[PDB]
Every structure is written in structure tokens, then in C-alpha cells.
Amino acid sequence: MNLMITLLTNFTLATLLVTIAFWLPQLNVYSEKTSPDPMGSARLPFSMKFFLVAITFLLFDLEIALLLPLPWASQTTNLNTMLTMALLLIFLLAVSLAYEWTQKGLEWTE
Amino acid sequence: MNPIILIIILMTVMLGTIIVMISTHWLLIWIGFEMNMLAIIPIMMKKHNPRATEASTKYFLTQSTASMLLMMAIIINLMFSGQWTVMKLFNPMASMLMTMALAMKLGMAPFHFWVPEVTQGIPLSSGLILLTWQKLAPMSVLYQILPSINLDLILTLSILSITIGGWGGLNQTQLRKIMAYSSIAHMGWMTAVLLYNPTMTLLNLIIYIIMTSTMFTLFMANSTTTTLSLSHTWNKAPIMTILVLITLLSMGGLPPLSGFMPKWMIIQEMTKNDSIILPTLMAITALLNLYFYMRLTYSTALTMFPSTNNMKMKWQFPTTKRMTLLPTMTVLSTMLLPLTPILSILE
Amino acid sequence: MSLVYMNIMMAFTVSLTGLLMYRSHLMSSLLCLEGMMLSLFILATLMILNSHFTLASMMPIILLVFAACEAALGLSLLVMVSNTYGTDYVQNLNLLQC
Amino acid sequence: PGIVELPSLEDLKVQEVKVSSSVLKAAAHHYGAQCDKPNKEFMLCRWEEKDPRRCLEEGKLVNQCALEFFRQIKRHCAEPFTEYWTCIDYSGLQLFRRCRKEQAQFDKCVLDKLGWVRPDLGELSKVTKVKTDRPLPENPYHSRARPEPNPEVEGDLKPARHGSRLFFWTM
Amino acid sequence: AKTLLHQYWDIPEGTECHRKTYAATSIGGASGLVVSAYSVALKTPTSFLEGVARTGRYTFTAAAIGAIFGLTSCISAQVREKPDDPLNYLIGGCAGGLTLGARTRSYGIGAAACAYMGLTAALVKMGQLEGWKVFAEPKV
Amino acid sequence: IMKDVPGWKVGESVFHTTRWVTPMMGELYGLRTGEEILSSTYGFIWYT
Amino acid sequence: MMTGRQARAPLQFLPDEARSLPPPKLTDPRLAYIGFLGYCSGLIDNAIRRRPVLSAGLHRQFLYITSFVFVGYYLLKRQDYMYAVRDHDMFSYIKSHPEDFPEKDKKTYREVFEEFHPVR
Amino acid sequence: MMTYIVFILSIIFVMGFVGFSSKPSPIYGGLGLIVSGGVGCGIVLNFGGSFLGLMVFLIYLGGMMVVFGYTTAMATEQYNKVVLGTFITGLLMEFLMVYYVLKDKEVEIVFKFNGMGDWVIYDTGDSGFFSEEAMGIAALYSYGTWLVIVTGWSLLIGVVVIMEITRGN
Amino acid sequence: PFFDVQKKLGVDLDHWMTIQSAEQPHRIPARCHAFEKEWIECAHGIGSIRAEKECKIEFEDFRECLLRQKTMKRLNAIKRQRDKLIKEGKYTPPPHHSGQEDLRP
Amino acid sequence: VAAFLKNVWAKEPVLVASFAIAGLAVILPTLSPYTKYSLMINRATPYNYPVPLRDDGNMPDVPSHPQDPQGPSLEWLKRL
């Protein structure tokens, strides 16, 4: 409960800071800004490379989560099976990186 | 369409289906289902046209909803059983959720609404794959859970699927939608018999797989997608017209062809368990199936539709396509009746 | 069983009734799919951690990863619609009916 | 179902080892070396009976002999034990590696005044044998008779009688 | 809606008209509600008011069909002093068909509905008497 | 506590077997104050 | 419906006890019918590729006949083994439980009553 | 009140799902389901599963719904009644079940469900010098050979799928 | 169908995860290890029909160990009776159920 | 096999360094004979109690006390 106490205290201090930054200068009577970017009227272009590198990040992070439990696993009895599994998984990461290299993935956003 | 990538993708589909077949754990069943659908997604995006994207989007949404239902059933079964052997479930809600999850996966009505659309928008090889190999794994899943299957739910799904498939195939003129509704009706026919004798289910599955493979192989060989080009094919090769006529005669369960083998023997396992009205109703809907089959053969071979002028150039070139396993699967779909008791090997 | 179990069932039924009767584009369907994801993950983790099944801690993480890749597939599908019709609305998915 | 049988508090009243964590941790090796046989008897009874209510008196024996350990600590070398347990107790993690000098002093004082050997690495991690006078329980799980297995198949595989008999087939 | 069928069949034929009438009316209302719900789900209504108008039309039509069929079967079974006769269900099915034809503004459709609903109710009586089981449990 | 209600046998174990079963947290601390319940069933997880 | 029989030796197309049966002859009518199916498949393969049906691909036709007759022989062996298992299990369970299978006293026609309905 | 904390969070969890059940816009739905993922991970963490909870934080929230927000930023250009009606319907159903389980302490929807607090099913035993779920996860590299094989194969095949079906040619 | 490759070529793939009573690292016991052991030894090699007709008591005990429904009902009834008896105030709780009893160790 | 190695070193030193390190990490656990030392180190860690077994009367390889010489000792980790 101490962790949640720290989280609540920190979140309330952030709330106090944003309340000071948002409502405290409203006491002043400066002006009202009527205010009548390079984007004139065109739609936002769908740069496909950003989406591709985002889902590549997603897949790599997923199998990084697969790769994670080695420090806990290092105390297991069957060390040979662990070594084979870890080397083959990192080899799978290398193979996926090589494929993402070959099929024009790392071009125009290298 | 890199040949190495296509070979690897096909091997992944085969590995996923065989993982569903040979595993003893529910998680591995779901693993095979997920890898199968993930590797079958590029098969329906072979031609790179927006209709294929539409069909694959609908297929992915339906299969993912079915998979989420499948985990709902698995987790409920774990709660009420505490164990993971693929066998009879230990909860009626688990059986109900699993039954309509597999009905959603297999395109059983009223969860059939994706089947006539998706098959309309994909190439014929992908349509053959979806209507032939995809049906194999959830048949194994339904076979391994038959003690806990509720009779009322599977019977309602079967009769609704047969009736809806016949009445929906009665109207379509495209070949792929007719094939989809025929597949729905055959799925209902061979799921109606599952709880009484699953050997009949396996026999009907093998017969339907062979006959649908023959039909799709003929459609890719003639390069025909609608009724009119299939009518026009009689200038090019009349022997192909004779073949499609005899296998469509076999497709409606008319003796002495192979398609009369399963359904009749399905009736042979309806009167053993004292059920008489049910095989009569499914026989009437099979007559509806035979009606639109007869319409297809009337359009195809039993008449002579008017052709165009360019057929003459098509008379100067033989069929260069890889017509693979067409004669063997054509013979095995027409003259297999005197070898009916071969179903004993499926026990 | 426990009340948190029934709360997870009610949450899953809420995600089910949100996934089917949508009005917006495919992003809402994928969000409800992720709701199903999260509900199944929490239910499996609670079951495994309550009954002390030590090995089946392989169940929750795997129950994400596979379908997570499947979820990524869905994103690509939406991009295809975003490369064809401009907007990913479900009312534009009426080309296969005829 | 059946009424669960429970011993009363009169079978549960004993003297208690009212000591802290570090007090037990400081002399744990000599604990395992000196009072080993009643501990082995009690946990063999616990592991084979799988029932506290059939082992309680045996545990009482341990709760006697363990006290006989601490008295022998108290009357002879109480001050080195005091130094050792307070040095161990200062550490929050209760690490054994941060109090090696007091460990050596306590070991030397014990070995000259009473002579208990600190066990080596791997000595306490091995499996020992117990000579016990209790009978072996034939039904530890309180299980009834298992169901009778179904009979197997016997005899030579005879040929088929009049063929497949599928409505006209004789072969 | 399984126990509603049992409550419909718990009342003996040609003995009490009222409870048979309400049981058949509730069966018809449930069937019309299912049909209307599927029609609204599949065919998109123009608005809320037209959708509930179609739902009310289907529900009231099917409830009237059920009430008329049950009432006619019961009065025929009373006037023939024979509960174990399919003629009463044939007459009730024809009355339901006539009511459906009158609702649909037709007469040939009404006669066809007379014939088919009378045959269906006769077969329902056949299954009730001889113990026909269309949903048979696996015996062998 | 309850000598008045009918249909009750004291010590009626809910398991058909007579084998010893490990007690629950609710079977042990289920009749004490709330603070002891908190420090027992959530003391370790909430300990910093 | 034999889920408890083959489970002791799974994935066996032809077990060892199947060798205890009389194997089917090479002149079995079903085997010759499957050979005829192979010949018909060869004829269809010659016909669909626009070739002389009775002359071209003689080695192809012989391979078709040989492959069909081989798979037909093995499938017939499996069928015979399965039906031997079926009626052996039938006779074994009939022998093991003769309380549910009483011996019916077959009465003669000299005292049993058959109702006669005249036709006119 | 404190002892039902997980249950309270579970209620908030259901609330979180309602926060994106009506689906007014994908961005607000993503925010609501982010909040629901946080409270569901708190539910997991209160049962002693630190590793699974940080799996939820690291991968589900911080590594995958980030990609969901990235994708939905590429559409849904910046600037309902039945949305709000479904919101009040879900609120009424949620609160009605809350009073049901807080008054009757028992309900029937599919099975028999109890409303008593969940602090009675935990364990007073000790795992020793290791967390049970920590080496439960650690047993993947010693026992889970086939599962790791199919997981790596499926993720590599997903990489193949991403490279192929989004090429457009 | 159900192809048994694992039983054919004799290689384990998922038999260890299949049941809760199987072998696990460091032999960590489940809550219902004995109940599941007795249920499996009751229901081994006799068929599912005779298992669900003859070993119903062991499976019911295993389900009660997993779900703990009867214990829930018993404890809830006891607690509700305590709340009622503190409402009419005929009985007061002893000091050993309040935290001031000089606990056993 | 010689000029191509220097070509891939001059072009992409990172890739050839990664391949060389991966090959060394593949071939060195098998070549180095200290893997068995880690195996017996991991297998001898007492995470659970060595629960004593009942003496029937004929067991010379088991002791009656942890200080007895018979049984598996762990002095090899002490010496190394």
C-alpha cells in the first residue's frame, strides 16, 4: 500500500502543478486572443514506412518478451537444452532481421 | 509470390493444421489454429486487388472472434476441471461456447455470413484451400469433444446450415458463391451425423474434399469464374464438359455415383437411433441442392450455348496449365460406389 | 466461485456486446478485440495464480504473444483500407455483396 | 460428510521457542548437527503420514531437544552467541558473509568448551536414513477400492463372417 | 421457450380452452419476436418507428395465428369429444392459415396456408401420439 | 455461536474423504478482526 | 466408434495380428475393379490433354494401373482387418455376457396364433 | 472496504471496459482501455504475480497499444446519443449487479456466483527461497521445447506476412 | 480425427503441461494434488462413461477443492449468523478472535 | 575464401564482427570442458529439503547423519 501511497502522492503533486500552470494565471486580465503550419488544406499523407517500422518494433518487442526469462532460467538443471533454445531463439531474431533487411524494409527509412 | 516464400507459407499452413491434429493440449490446438489463419492470410492476398483485401478483412475478423470464443471455452473448462486434456468438457457453458466457436470457424449457419462473401473475392486456388483444407482441423476438434456435445444445439445448427445453404445456393449465378453455399450445406449434412457415428462424418468429409477439389481443379483448368464462361467452354474441350457434367451429377448424390455414398449411409445411421423425419428433411434440402446443380449442368453441357468469334484462336492452342490430379480425383469422385465399405479404414 | 471471476465474465460479455454492434470503423472492432485479449489474459492469470499450477504460467504470456502478432496482422489490413478508400469505415465494405 | 477429527488444546500446550529470526539463524548449523535425529524422525513421520494429527507428539520431542540445544548454548558460551546473533541481526538481508570474524570466534569458543563441528558445504544438503518404530500406513490417502478394469481382448483374429454384410456385399 | 411447450402440452386436449389459448398465444408471440428480431438485424429499418411498426406487425400477426389455432383446435376437440384425433389440429391449422391469409390480404396464400398448417399440426399430433422423435438421443 | 438453527452438525467437513486437507486463509483467519486478515492475506504482497 | 481399440497401438495402418488373417488374393474382384479404375483414370488423363486415348502414354497407363492396384490391395487388407476386429469383438462380448442375451425358446407353428385377415 | 480491493479494482475494470464499450472514437476508446489495462494489471499484481503484471505493463500497454495509437494516428482526422444511451445502460446493469452482490452476496446468471470477499482462497504456505511464478516462467527454456519452437516459427512467419501482404504488389 | 504421433514415435511434446498433478520444477505442490491423483487413479483405463458413472464422488471432491463452493456457503452462513447475533446482542466474541490473545509463538 | 573475408571486413565490419562473435559463442560451449562444472554446480543446489528415507535395513550408500563420510559431498566446489 506504500507503493500506491507514493503513486497517489506523485499524481496529486502533478495535478497541483498542472492546476498552477492552468488556472493560477487566469487571475490576470491580459487579453483575449482571437488569432484569425505548412499544412494548407491537404490530407495527412500515409507514410507507410513509419507504420512498417512500428509493427516491426511490435514483433521484435514481442519476441524480446519471449527472450526475457533467461536470468531466472539460468539456474535450471538441464543447461544444454536451455543453451540450445536461447541460441536458436537469438538466431531466429537474426534471421528475421536478415529478412527485414533483404525485402526492401530498410530502405528510404534506413 | 516468391516460390520460396510460397513454399514456406504452405508448409506453415500444413504444420498448423497437423499441430491441431496431433496435439494433446488445448493451447497447442489454439496455436495450430492461429498459425493456420496467420499463414492463410497471404494466400487470399495473392492477386493484390481490393476485393481480396475486403474478403481477407472479413475472414480475419470472423476467425479472430471465433478464436476469442475458443479461449473463453478453454478458460471456463480450466476453471471447472483444472486440467487440459483434449477430451470431453466439464461444463455446459464450455460446450456451448466451443460449439458456436467452431460453428463460426466452419461457416455453419447462422454464423455462415462470411462464407459466400470471402470465397467470392479470392482467387480460385485460395478458394479451394479455404473450402477444402480449412475444414479439416475443426472436424478433428469436434470429433475429440463429442461426449460433451449438446445434442439440441448441434442439431439446430446442422438443420439451419443445410436449409440456409440450399436456399442461398438456389439463387446465386456466380460459381464461387454456389460453391460456398454447397460447402455450407455439405457441412451441415456431415455435422448432423457426428453424434451418432463419426465414421460417417469422416467419410463424408473425405468425399466432399475430393469432390470439391475436382470441381475447383476443373474451374482453374477452364479459367472460368461465372456461369457464362463455363457455358462457353464447350468450344474448347468437350471432354471437360463431360467431366464437369458427371461430377456435378455426382455432386447432388445421384446414384450410381460417389456422392450417393455418404448421405445414404448417413441415413443408415439415422434410423438406427430411431430418427425418421430428420433424414427426410435433409434429403429434401439435398433435392434443392440437386436443383441448382441441374441448373448448372443445363447451362454447361446438356445444351449448346452461343459462343463468340475468338474461340478459333483458342482452338489453335492446347491447355498449357498444370492440370494436376484431375483424372485421379475425377475417377475417385464418380466410380467409388462399389467400394463403399472402404470407410472401414476410417474407424 | 470468487466475485472477481464473475466480474471478468461480465467484462468479457461487455467486450462481446461492444465488438458486434459497432457503428464506427475497424479500429473500434480491433479495440474490442483487445478488450477480449485483456479479459482472457487477466482471467487466465488469476486462475493459474490461485490454484498454484506452476507450469501453466506458460499459459498467460503465450496467450498474448500469438494473437498479438495476429492483432498486428489486423493493423495491416486497416492500412490496406486506408490505401484504397481513404477512410477505413465499415459502410464502405459493400463491394462483395453483388 | 464425515466429521473432521481435531485434537483439543490439551494436546497442543507446550513450551515455545520464543526467539527471533537471527537467533535461530546464528546457531542453525549446530542446530542441524546436534539435534538431527529427532528432526529426521518428526519429518519422516510428517512426510509419510501426511497428517499433523498423527505426528504431534513427535514434534513435541523436537520441541524438547531444541530447548536442550539452547540451554547448552546459554550455560557455557552465551556471550559469543550474543555477539554473533546481534552482528547477524544488524543486517537487513541477514547475510552470513558480513560476520565472518564473529562466526570464527563462536566456532572456536564452541569447539574448545563443548566441541561441536560446523558442517561443511553439502553435508546438510544430503539425504539421510531414519530408524523409526512406527508402522507403515497402507492407506495414506484414505482411498477406497479402485473400480474393476474392463476385460481385454483374447483369442485368434478369426476371419470375417459372411463378408462386410453391407446390404448386398459378400466380400 | 422449451418449458412453454411443456406447459402447452401439460393441459389436456379439449378440456380447458383458456390456458391452451394463452399458451399458444405466448408461443406465437415468441416466434414472431424471434422472426422480427432477425428481420431487423438483417434488413436495416428505415427508422426506429418503422422498425417497431414491423416488429409489432410480425409479433401481433404470429400471436393471432397461435391464439386462433389453439382456440380452434380446442373447440373442435370439445365438439368431437375426442382429444386423440388429428382432425382437431387439422381444423385449427386451417383456421390459422385462414387468419394468416386474411392478415396478408390474400386468399390463395390463405388456402395454401390452410393446407400446409393443417398438415403440419396433424403431424404434430402424430408425433405426440405415436412418440415420434425428430431430435433423437444417440441410442446405438 | 449458533445452537438455535436446525439442520446443522458441528465440524461437518465438506469433503467426502477423511484425508487431511490443507486449511484455507478463510478457514483460519475468517473469524478474526479485519486488520489481522489484511496482514495475513495481503501482508507479504503489500510489504513495500 | 472404435476409439478404445486402436489406442494401444496408434497410427498403425496394418498391425501384426492382421497377418493372422487370410490375405486377399491377387484375383480379388474388388482389386480388379480398382485396377479398372486406374485404367479409366489413365484414359481420362489421355483424353483431357488431347492425346490418342488408346495408344499414347502406355507406360503412363501401366503406372496408373500399378499404383491403383497397390493402394487398393493395401486398403482391402485394412478393411478385412477392421471387419475381423468388428465381428471378433461382437462374438467376444456376446460370449462374455449371456444374461442380456437369453436363449429364446423357438416355438413351433402348431400352437402359436397368427391372425388371419381374409382378402375379398 | 480495503479487504475487497481486488474486487473494487475488478469493478473499475468493468467500468474501464464500459469506457470503450460504446466506442465513440478510437482514440478515446484507446485511452479508456489503457486505463482498464492498468487496473487489470493492478488486479494481477495484488495476487502476487509481479512478473505477469509487468508483462502486462511492458508488452500489452507500453509496447503494443503504443503501436495501436500509432496506427490510429494515421487515420481518424481531428475535428453520440446512442453511445450515451448504451453508457447509461451499462452503468445501470453494472450498478444493479453491484447491489445484487452487495446485498444478496449470491447471484445466478449462468452458474451460482458468490458475493463474499475473495480474501478466503489465498494460501498460507511458503514456496521457500523462490517465487513460484518466477521459476514457473523460467521453466520455459528447460521443458517448453515444442512451444518455443512453434512460437518462434509463428513470429517469423508473421514477419513474412508483414513483408508480403503489405508490399502491395 | 485424433492422430497420436507422440504415442507413435515415443516423444513427449505436451504431456507434462496437460494435468495439474504432473511433475513440475522443484516439486511444488498444487492445492488439489491429492484429489486429482485419486481422481485420475479412479478414472484410468475404465472408459469415460464408467468414469463419470462410478467415480463421481472423487471428481465431485476434486471440483469442491478447485472451486470451494460449500466452504464458501458454510463460512458465509457462519458470518451472517455472527452478524445477526451481534445485532440482537446475545453473544460477544472472545478476546482470542480480536488480536489481543498473546499468539502461540 | 581469403579476399572475400577481407572484403566483407572492409565493407561491413559490424556484420562480420557479429558473425564471428556468434560463431565463437556457438563453438565455445562445446569446446570448453567447464560446462559440466556448471552442470554439477546447478544440480547440487538444495532448493528443497533432502527428505530422509525409511531405513529398511539394507542401504550402505546412505548415512544416518549429515556428518558421516558416506554420501555425496561438495568439497569440489570448495577446492575448484
Domains, chain C, ordered by start: 1-86 (1.10.287.3510)
Q: Is A80 at the interface with chain H, CB within 8 A?
A: no
Q: Is I14 at the interface with chain H, CB within 8 A?
A: yes
Tell me the shortest Cα–Cα distance from J32 to chain D, in angstroms: 26
Distance in angstroms (rounded) separating the CA atoms of residues I77 and I89? 18
Q: Please, do chains D and G touch (3+ CB pairs < 8 Å)?
A: yes
- Give, rounded to a whole angstrom, the gap between the first and last alpha carbons of chain F: 38
Does the N-terminal peptide bond of residue B138 adopt cis geometry, omega within 30 degrees of 0?
no
Distance in angstroms (rounded) separating the CA atoms of residues I2 and E37? 40
A76/J45 Cβ within 8 A: no
Give the residues across from H112 on adjacent strands: H108
Nearest-10 Cα torsion for B165, B167, B172, B174: 20
Mutation target to probe the D interface, by most D beta carbons within 10 A, among F13, F20, F22 is F20
C-chain residues near H144 (CB < 8 A): 58
I50/D147 Cβ within 8 A: yes
Cell readout for J65 is 547423519
* SS3 annotation, chain H: CHHHHHHHHHHHHHHHHHHHHCCCCHHHHHHHHHHHHHHHHHHHHCCCCHHHHHHHHHHHHCCCHHHHHHHHCCCCCCCCHHHHHHHHHHHHHHHHHHHHHHHCCEEECCCEEECCCCCCCCCCCCCCCCCHHHHHHHCCCCCCHHHHHHHHHHHHHHHHHHHHHCCCC
Q: Is H143 at the interface with chain B, CB within 8 A?
A: no
Distance in angstroms (rounded) separating the CA atoms of residues I23 and I12? 13
B88 neighbors B147 (Cβ within 8 angstroms): yes
| Residue partners of D57: CB distance under 8 A and separation at least 6 | none
Cell readout for H151 is 512460437
Distance in angstroms (rounded) separating the CA atoms of residues C21 and C36? 15
- Whole-Å CA distances, C49 to A107, C56, H38, H43: 46, 9, 18, 12
Q: By three-state DSSP, how is residue F12 classified?
A: strand
Q: Phi and psi dihedrals of E2, rounded to 5?
A: -90, -45
| Residue partners of H50: CB distance under 8 A and separation at least 6 | H131, H133
CATH code at A34? 1.20.58.1610
Distance in angstroms (rounded) separating the CA atoms of residues B69 and B89? 15
Tell me the shortest Cα–Cα distance from H123 to chain I, in angstroms: 9
Instruction: Give the number of domains in chain A.
Output: 1
Between A and H, how many residue pairs show a Cβ–Cβ distance under 8 A?
Answer: 96
Q: Phi and psi dihedrals of H76, rounded to 5?
A: 55, 65
Distance in angstroms (rounded) separating the CA atoms of residues E61 and B81? 47
Give the residues across from B25 on adjacent strands: B85
Distance in angstroms (rounded) separating the CA atoms of residues B211 and B187? 13
A94/J45 Cβ within 8 A: no
Tell me the shortest Cα–Cα distance from F47 to chain D, in angstroms: 14
Mutation target to probe the B interface, by most B beta carbons within 10 A, among C6, C70, C92 is C70
Give the residues across from H108 on adjacent strands: H112
Instruction: Give the number of domains in chain H.
Output: 1
Q: Is J57 at the interface with chain D, CB within 8 A?
A: no
Which is it for the CA torsion A60, A65, A66, A72, positive or negative? positive
Q: Which residue has the cell 446482542?
A: I89
A-chain residues near J25 (CB < 8 A): 87
Whether A61 is covered by a domain: the verdict is yes
D45 neighbors D132 (Cβ within 8 angstroms): yes
Computed on alpha carbons and rounded to an integer, the radius of gyration of chain H in Å comes to 21
Closest CA to E5 of E107, E116, E128: E128
Nearest-10 Cα torsion for D46, D50, D53, D55: -20
B92 neighbors C68 (Cβ within 8 angstroms): no
Closest CA to B33 of B104, B105, B132, B116: B105
H-chain residues near J48 (CB < 8 A): 128
Distance in angstroms (rounded) separating the CA atoms of residues G66 and D53? 76
Q: Which residue has the cell 556428518?
A: J67
- Whole-Å CA distances, B303 to B232, B246, B294, B330, C19: 11, 14, 12, 22, 49
Cell readout for J51 is 527428505
Crossing angle between the packed helical segments B175-192 and B124-132, to the nearest 10 degrees: 10
Q: Phi and psi dihedrals of B174, rounded to 5?
A: -70, 145
Tell me the shortest Cα–Cα distance from A46 to chain F, in angstroms: 47
Report I:4-63 residues touching D (Cβ under 8 A).
34, 37-38, 41-42, 45-47, 50, 54-55
Distance in angstroms (rounded) separating the CA atoms of residues D155 and G92? 9
Report C:30-49 residues touching H (Cβ under 8 A).
30-32, 34-35, 37-39, 41-42, 45-46, 49
Distance in angstroms (rounded) separating the CA atoms of residues D29 and D111? 13
Helix or strand run (H / E) with residue J54: strand J53-54
Q: For chain H, after which residues does the C atom lie more than 2.5 Å from the next written residue's N, i.e. where is it broken?
A: 79
Q: Is A62 at the interface with chain J, CB within 8 A?
A: no
Helix, strand, coil: what percent of chain C each, to 5?
75, 0, 25
- Residue among H150, H157, H168 minimizing CB distance to B31: H150
Domain span at H89? 4-166
Distance in angstroms (rounded) separating the CA atoms of residues I67 and I74? 14
Any idea where the domains of chain D sit in the sequence? 1-137
C56/I69 Cβ within 8 A: no
Mutation target to probe the A interface, by most A beta carbons within 10 A, among H78, H137, H142 is H142
Domain span at B85? 1-347
Does the N-terminal peptide bond of residue B256 adopt cis geometry, omega within 30 degrees of 0?
yes
CATH code at H117? 1.20.120.1200
Longest alpha-carbon distance in chain J: 74
> Which chains reach chain F with 3 or more Cβ–Cβ distances below 8 angstroms?
A, D, H, I
Closest CA to H19 of C32, B143, A89: C32
Distance in angstroms (rounded) separating the CA atoms of residues B110 and B113? 7
| Residue partners of J18: CB distance under 8 A and separation at least 6 | none
Nearest-5° Cα angle at J17, J14 to J20: 150
A77 neighbors J42 (Cβ within 8 angstroms): yes
Q: Which residue has the cell 516462467?
A: H137
B334 neighbors B254 (Cβ within 8 angstroms): no
I17/B82 Cβ within 8 A: no
B223 neighbors B207 (Cβ within 8 angstroms): no
C-chain residues near A48 (CB < 8 A): 79, 83
- Residue among J50, J59, J77 minimizing CB distance to D126: J50
Domain span at A88? 1-103
Give the residues across from H107 on adjacent strands: H113
> Which chains reach chain I with 3 or more Cβ–Cβ distances below 8 angstroms?
B, C, D, F, G, H, J
B347 neighbors G1 (Cβ within 8 angstroms): yes
Residue E115 is classified by DSSP as H
Cell readout for A4 is 500506491
Closest CA to C33 of C44, C47, C22, C45: C22
H37 neighbors H60 (Cβ within 8 angstroms): yes
- Give, rounded to a whole angstrom, the gap between the first and last alpha carbons of chain A: 47
Q: Is D13 at the interface with chain I, CB within 8 A?
A: no
Q: Which residue has the cell 463419470?
A: I52
Q: Is J47 at the interface with chain I, CB within 8 A?
A: yes
Measured in whole angstroms, the distance separating CA C85 from the mean position of its chain's CA atoms is 25
Instruction: Give the number of domains in chain B.
Output: 1
Q: By three-state DSSP, how is residue A32 classified?
A: coil
B9/H160 Cβ within 8 A: yes
Nearest-10 Cα torsion for B73, B79, B80, B85: 70
| Residue partners of J70: CB distance under 8 A and separation at least 6 | J60, J61, J62, J63
Q: Please, do chains I and E touch (3+ CB pairs < 8 Å)?
A: no
Distance in angstroms (rounded) separating the CA atoms of residues J75 and D12? 43
Experimental method: cryo-EM
Distance in angstroms (rounded) separating the CA atoms of residues E39 and D74? 90
Nearest-5° Cα angle at H93, H90 to H97: 140
